[PDB]
Ligand binder design. Structure first.
Ligand SMILES: *[C@@H]1O[C@H](CO[C@H]2O[C@@H](C)[C@@H](O)[C@@H](O)[C@@H]2O)[C@@H](O[C@@H]2O[C@H](CO)[C@@H](O)[C@H](O)[C@H]2NC(C)=O)[C@H](O)[C@H]1NC(C)=O
Ligand SMILES: *[C@@H]1O[C@H](CO[C@H]2O[C@@H](C)[C@@H](O)[C@@H](O)[C@@H]2O)[C@@H](O[C@@H]2O[C@H](CO)[C@@H](O)[C@H](O)[C@H]2NC(C)=O)[C@H](O)[C@H]1NC(C)=O
Ligand SMILES: *[C@@H]1O[C@H](CO[C@H]2O[C@@H](C)[C@@H](O)[C@@H](O)[C@@H]2O)[C@@H](O[C@@H]2O[C@H](CO)[C@@H](O)[C@H](O)[C@H]2NC(C)=O)[C@H](O)[C@H]1NC(C)=O
Ligand SMILES: *[C@@H]1O[C@H](CO[C@H]2O[C@@H](C)[C@@H](O)[C@@H](O)[C@@H]2O)[C@@H](O[C@@H]2O[C@H](CO)[C@@H](O)[C@H](O)[C@H]2NC(C)=O)[C@H](O)[C@H]1NC(C)=O
Ligand SMILES: *[C@@H]1O[C@H](CO[C@H]2O[C@@H](C)[C@@H](O)[C@@H](O)[C@@H]2O)[C@@H](O[C@@H]2O[C@H](CO)[C@@H](O)[C@H](O)[C@H]2NC(C)=O)[C@H](O)[C@H]1NC(C)=O
Ligand SMILES: *[C@@H]1O[C@H](CO[C@H]2O[C@@H](C)[C@@H](O)[C@@H](O)[C@@H]2O)[C@@H](O[C@@H]2O[C@H](CO)[C@@H](O)[C@H](O)[C@H]2NC(C)=O)[C@H](O)[C@H]1NC(C)=O
Ligand SMILES: *[C@@H]1O[C@H](CO[C@H]2O[C@@H](C)[C@@H](O)[C@@H](O)[C@@H]2O)[C@@H](O)[C@H](O)[C@H]1NC(C)=O
Ligand SMILES: *[C@@H]1O[C@H](CO[C@H]2O[C@@H](C)[C@@H](O)[C@@H](O)[C@@H]2O)[C@@H](O)[C@H](O)[C@H]1NC(C)=O
Ligand SMILES: *[C@@H]1O[C@H](CO[C@H]2O[C@@H](C)[C@@H](O)[C@@H](O)[C@@H]2O)[C@@H](O)[C@H](O)[C@H]1NC(C)=O
Ligand SMILES: *[C@@H]1O[C@H](CO)[C@@H](O)[C@H](O)[C@H]1NC(C)=O
Ligand SMILES: *[C@@H]1O[C@H](CO)[C@@H](O)[C@H](O)[C@H]1NC(C)=O
Ligand SMILES: *[C@@H]1O[C@H](CO)[C@@H](O)[C@H](O)[C@H]1NC(C)=O
Ligand SMILES: *[C@@H]1O[C@H](CO)[C@@H](O)[C@H](O)[C@H]1NC(C)=O
Ligand SMILES: *[C@H]1O[C@H](CO)[C@@H](O)[C@H](O)[C@H]1NC(C)=O
Ligand SMILES: *[C@H]1O[C@H](CO)[C@@H](O)[C@H](O)[C@H]1NC(C)=O
Ligand SMILES: *[C@H]1O[C@H](CO)[C@@H](O)[C@H](O)[C@H]1NC(C)=O
Ligand SMILES: *[P@@](=O)(NCCC)OCC
Ligand SMILES: [Cl-]
Ligand SMILES: [Cl-]
Ligand SMILES: [Cl-]
Ligand SMILES: [Cl-]
Ligand SMILES: [Cl-]
Ligand SMILES: [Cl-]
Ligand SMILES: [Cl-]
Ligand SMILES: [Cl-]
Ligand SMILES: [Cl-]
Ligand code: NA
Ligand code: NA
Lengths: 527, 176, 352, 176
């Protein structure tokens, strides 16, 4: 029976047999006052503190959010939907510790992605007990507010200042600073890690001064704040806050009145209108995201990046080989998970309309021009592959590569990887390739579980990834030093070396997507 | 190994087995089949071409190294045999430029480009294709050992072909 | 010493650890141990470092051994705090008496109960901590003796004796490898034979006798001390490496055994300065000079002898790998000790 | 000065020591002495430094000299705190009067009683401390005069006079 006392009270955990060993899980420890009522839309507040013993023996509620109902009964999509009740009262974190209680363990803190509109730390692919069993690190993850309830902004106004969910992430990192040594953790060795919006989040904590002393290093999976979906301009943010006001009949004249009104609507009604705060939208819409609030984020982050203002420490950044594929079956004419989606040229053109809504005609032709001159005009899946590349390179790959270059230029070691293994168990079709989100399970160690139908080659890839990640976290270098592994070079502006992750040989290459990111990065931002 | 390494101490032969047969992982049935082709390629052709080029580049001259990895759509030998010995020749000579002849589009394109790199080397001492936005072919140096891969899709700059294997053929084996 | 030494006149801010064989291994692990990081300033490593193959026990073998011990003292239990509670009742002699057998084959260099990765003194495999630069940053002086491996041959290798000259045969050498490399694939063992027995030339009778001492020195002490020092120097700090090659005029073991393991210690401690004691002039001189280099390292982080026109001791760098030879005649700067042999121990062997 | 100079308007954080001949030697040893390390910022050395051959006395000669002094003032004892206790009774003039003879030959540049390695102000031979970089790290200004040695010749070298031009011969030079 395992009780540990925290600044805020006592908590009891639960024992778990993992790979003939034991890990102790403390699931659902709260970490702020629930943000209800007068608290809805505001920065998270001090956890007040309990006598008695909190039982942290189940996952807690997920924050309120819309669910994906595009493919009901389909594991591919439904594995991302929340798997505990939704509730405004959702500010809880989990801790996983090795048994016996370690003495001064390195801490991995996961930030889930979800477009800032969705996600929960209790997904199966985010289970921290393999890491803690196998590398005897500690693993912490947090639920943070998503959608309007976490990122609604009316700037300057503390009733709705913006970035609420980013400060919930922040107050969780404070909670580990204050409390983790009690579970055996080293607060001086914390690595943040995250995927997609959770990676974007990690990147902004690197820019945020209030985070600067709550962690040591950073991992960025398929995401960084300079991605085009990751930050909302102050313009659009008020437009959206007021479009929301409109839609819930809350338009007012006093702005503390709009908020006061909005703080009365039921959850379902805010959720139900989020999708429409915006005229055209796309499968990659982020209607309520991070903003420059003068508080968490003191200036446009692209400026802060360029001018070297951010935490100086090492970063590990990566992307998957087919990032863009997963979003095509949510709206691009011709695309299906249930056939092979050979689309035509005219369909590709229509696709650009779905993905690049407004979006000058010359903008769109220039993408066509870049992506459709091939070698050669023969192959039927030419147009199908090109549209996935537009979307991967634009939305994820080129921005992760430019973050890493700008970041490495100021001095610190960075490592870049290029993940290209397709999971033997992937439920989406072949044509969709090495999809977005599908490294997560390798990073968390799921394939180490033999009982589970992954290949030998996959267990091996996983065991090695897990060791590189845990070496980065403790040592700032992601090598696997024992099993004659390919050495992972640092990424520099100049040679731009990266390491490829696959079940066969892993290689050192140079200048991923060189010709394509020259398009996205220098020319496109102009159209 | 007995057929290919006739005389050939027993320790010689085990050491080849040792080098080539510890894998990741023991699962795949064609493990042993692939390993024997590699023993024979790396020993007989690849490691010695790579060591010639290093020794030669060390004295001063520009060298270029390529790694051909396209399997001819018309190859008459079985699939498992892969990108075989002798089967670049036809690309170098231009046979796939003859449309009349049942090679893919992608193959004509690969050929036309090879032919131009070879003819640029011959006239200019540099095998670039300069017109069609082609990947630039670095010189090979002792140090980074860069090579260019030739295939119908993208051609890449890589480093240190067969590094671990030629360390075996080149430093250790000559001793057995 | 941190708490108390200033009372005896000591500077707690100037402490050098020094040690030989397992004591050197120990010094090396205090360099890796965070709890030691602030209890000393610098480190000396004589014939030893934690990456030697006998210096650290894997968690696997350790429990195997703890339970084999439990077995052997009828203490096997089911509750582990029970095995210990039991073991805490046995008389000393009984634990000692069974130590040798916690292990199926063993060898003259067995270390049945050693350091382990306990998550406390040693937070990860030390080879990883070494490679990734996690250890106290300060200067190190590392060295080995010229015939490290000889002393262990007369404890078990067929043909060997302190009481004759031990000219062994090829078949005896092969048997020797069985004693020293117990389990130990056959190809492993042939490959050692292959490396160490192709000579120039097949004539000399003590060919096989010398080769077996070299297998054992280079494997167990020399190559691992040299690789510790390279890995360590690669992160920034000054290191000095020496190669001790003086045979004590008073050595009681036979000539063929050469400059043995353990036999620098007396030079380092100053015993030959005691004239009353039957060491040569040349030996007093060697000692007085060693003592001064060691004491200069400790106080100044540089082991020079600055007064008596002495050969200057270069730092060891990955690249030139310079070392200094210690003998009664001239001491020299050389390069890349045991280059061909440690390429064998260090890159290839760990694979067999 | 550390304790009191700010009262007169001084910056204790900006102190330069300066000195000539033995005073320069002194400055140089304060650079080596840990107890001085934080009582000044920088150092000037005029015609002098502790590695000059007259600037430091070996522990050997020092006891020889202390006891030769003891002898000469009838203070030889067996208890050394007794020699000192004795010496602490002699009048000043008597110590001064015997200083010159604590030493068999001496020269115009004799330093019969100087700095020594005492384990306190000076923790090791200073030449070692110099070579091995153990001394205050700060800037130094050092200098010498063009005819340093001339002044000592008229105190003993045969042929030399302040009152004529001292053209000496080869045999005189040798005597010098
Ligand atoms: C800022 O918001 C306005 C508001 O428009 C909206 O009203 C909201 C409640 C919501 O329902 C939304 O879907 C609706 O469009 C946007 O104005 C609209 O722009 C489009 C094309 O520009 C027109 O066809 C609409 O008729 C027009 N609506 C109104 C009522 O004016 C405006 O576009 C937006 N800014 C951006 C850049 O997206
Ligand atoms: C692959 O499927 C797409 C997807 O649309 C369909 O899913 C199919 C399996 C189909 O049978 C039907 O249930 C569903 O509409 C097919 O494209 C569709 O084709 C029609 C013309 O019938 C369009 O007007 C539809 O809107 C269009 N769907 C989309 C997403 O735009 C696509 O044709 C199919 N192609 C194949 C088999 O290669
Ligand atoms: C881990 O220990 C076992 C235990 O074996 C031993 O029992 C101990 C009490 C001790 O007396 C010991 O000498 C005895 O062998 C080892 O198993 C043994 O392995 C050898 C060869 O592998 C066999 O011939 C023995 O019969 C076998 N003994 C038993 C009782 O199983 C085991 O080898 C060891 N692990 C390693 C890698 O050394
Ligand atoms: C050098 O001595 C070894 C050591 O073994 C012996 O010590 C000798 C001095 C010997 O007289 C005897 O007291 C003791 O056994 C000799 O090897 C031994 O030879 C025998 C054959 O008689 C083997 O069966 C022994 O086991 C073997 N000993 C060992 C250690 O294996 C060795 O022959 C001898 N050689 C000389 C004189 O060159
Ligand atoms: C260490 O001191 C001795 C002591 O000698 C001296 O007695 C002193 C009181 C003083 O008066 C002094 O001038 C007198 O010499 C030195 O021994 C002397 O050495 C010289 C030549 O070596 C001889 O001619 C003297 O006779 C001899 N005197 C005695 C009484 O022994 C000794 O030289 C000195 N060490 C050094 C290196 O200078
Ligand atoms: C320069 O003077 C030296 C110094 O000695 C003398 O000082 C003179 C001015 C001289 O008249 C006298 O008062 C005093 O001795 C002369 O050398 C001296 O010469 C004599 C020979 O008479 C030696 O035996 C003296 O000891 C010697 N003195 C010294 C210092 O050794 C020197 O000759 C004179 N030379 C000139 C004028 O060039
Ligand atoms: C636990 O270790 C503390 C600091 O360790 C870290 O140093 C940091 C700057 C960072 O590099 C981390 O990754 C290092 O591991 C130490 O000061 C504490 O006192 C320690 N407490 C213990 C051992 O319980
Ligand atoms: C004794 O000296 C102290 C420090 O000396 C050391 O500086 C260390 C960092 C290390 O390099 C040692 O080798 C140096 O010698 C000083 O701070 C104390 O105050 C001193 N106390 C005394 C003189 O009694
Ligand atoms: C007087 O100045 C103080 C320090 O000045 C010195 O900085 C030193 C490190 C050294 O370089 C000197 O040469 C510099 O001049 C300052 O901290 C005091 O507070 C000052 N007090 C005053 C102005 O009265
Ligand atoms: C907390 O859980 C423990 C564990 O069984 C139980 O004993 C205790 O009463 C629980 N308190 C609750 C559910 O409030
Ligand atoms: C090392 O490889 C072995 C098999 O040789 C295996 O036990 C394990 O997966 C490896 N360790 C790491 C970190 O990859
Ligand atoms: C250049 O590419 C064109 C098609 O754009 C084609 O005519 C020809 O194959 C190319 N020239 C060379 C040398 O490859
Ligand atoms: C210096 O050499 C002398 C003999 O010239 C001797 O007194 C002593 O052994 C030496 N000092 C040192 C540190 O070796
Ligand atoms: C608007 O009116 C209300 C009064 O209750 C208040 O909450 C808000 O701050 C006011 N601001 C102004 C000056 O318009
Ligand atoms: C085993 O039993 C004893 C009870 O006296 C105890 O010392 C030990 O911790 C127990 N552990 C378990 C749960 O098996
Ligand atoms: C010598 O005698 C006196 C006693 O008054 C004392 O001052 C000195 O320390 C003594 N030392 C010894 C032990 O000879
Ligand atoms: P990431 O959190 N970002 C995509 C922006 C909509 O993953 C979405 C599936
Ligand atoms: Cl084609
Ligand atoms: Cl690898
Ligand atoms: Cl690419
Ligand atoms: Cl496999
Ligand atoms: Cl190309
Ligand atoms: Cl290769
Ligand atoms: Cl010979
Ligand atoms: Cl010397
Ligand atoms: Cl050698
Ligand atoms: Na353009
Ligand atoms: Na070998």
């Amino acid at each position: 029976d395992i009780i540990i006392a925290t600044k805020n009270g006592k908590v009891r955990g639960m024992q778990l047999t993992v790979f003939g060993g034991t890990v102790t899980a403390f699931l659902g420890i709260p970490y702020a006052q629930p943000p209800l009522g007068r608290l809805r839309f505001k920065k998270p507040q001090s956890l007040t503190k309990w006598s008695d013993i909190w039982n942290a023996t189940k996952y807690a509620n997920s924050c309120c959010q819309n669910i994906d109902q595009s493919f009901p009964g389909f594991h591919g999509s439904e594995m991302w939907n929340p798997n505990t009740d939704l509730s405004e009262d959702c500010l809880y974190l989990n801790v996983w510790i090795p048994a016996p209680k370690p003495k001064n363990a390195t801490v991995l803190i996961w930030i889930y992605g979800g477009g800032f509109q969705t996600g929960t730390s209790s997904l199966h692919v985010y289970d921290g007990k393999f890491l803690a069993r196998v590398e005897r690190v500690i693993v912490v993850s947090m639920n943070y507010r998503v959608g309007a309830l976490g990122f609604l902004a009316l700037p300057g106004n503390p009733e709705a200042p913006g970035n609420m969910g980013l400060f919930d992430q922040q107050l969780a990192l404070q909670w580990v600073q204050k409390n983790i040594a009690a579970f055996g953790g080293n607060p001086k060795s914390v690595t943040l890690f995250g995927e997609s919006a959770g990676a974007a989040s990690v990147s902004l904590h690197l820019l945020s001064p209030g985070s600067h002393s709550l962690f040591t290093r950073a991992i960025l999976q398929s995401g960084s704040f300079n991605a085009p979906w990751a930050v909302t301009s102050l313009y659009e943010a008020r437009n959206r806050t007021l479009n929301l006001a409109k839609l819930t009949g809350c338009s007012r004249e006093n702005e503390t009145e709009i908020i006061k009104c909005l703080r009365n609507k039921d959850p379902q009604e805010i959720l139900l209108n989020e999708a429409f705060v915006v005229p055209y939208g796309t499968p990659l819409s982020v209607n309520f995201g991070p903003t420059v609030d003068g508080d968490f984020l003191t200036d446009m982050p692209d400026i802060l990046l360029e001018l070297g203002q951010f935490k100086k420490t090492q970063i590990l950044v990566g992307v998957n080989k087919d990032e863009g594929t997963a979003f095509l079956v949510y709206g691009a004419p011709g695309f299906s998970k249930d056939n092979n989606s050979i689309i035509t040229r005219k369909e590709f053109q229509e696709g650009l309309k779905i993905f690049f809504p407004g979006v000058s005609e010359f903008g769109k032709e220039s993408i066509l021009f870049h992506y459709t001159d091939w070698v050669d005009d023969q192959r039927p899946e030419n147009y199908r592959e090109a549209l996935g590349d537009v979307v991967g390179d634009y939305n994820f790959i080129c921005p992760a590569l430019e973050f890493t270059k700008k970041f490495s230029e100021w001095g610190n070691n960075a490592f870049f990887y290029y993940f290209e293994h397709r999971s033997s168990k992937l439920p989406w079709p072949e044509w969709m390739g090495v999809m977005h989100g599908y490294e997560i399970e390798f990073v968390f160690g799921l394939p180490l579980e033999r009982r589970d139908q992954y290949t030998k080659a996959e267990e091996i890839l996983s065991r090695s990834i897990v060791k590189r990640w845990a070496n980065f976290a403790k040592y700032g270098n992601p090598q696997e030093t024992q099993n004659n592994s390919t050495s992972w070079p640092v990424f520099k502006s100049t040679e731009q070396k990266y390491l490829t992750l696959n079940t066969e040989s892993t290689r050192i290459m140079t200048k991923l997507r060189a010709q394509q990111c020259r398009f996205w990065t220098s020319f496109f931002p102009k159209v």
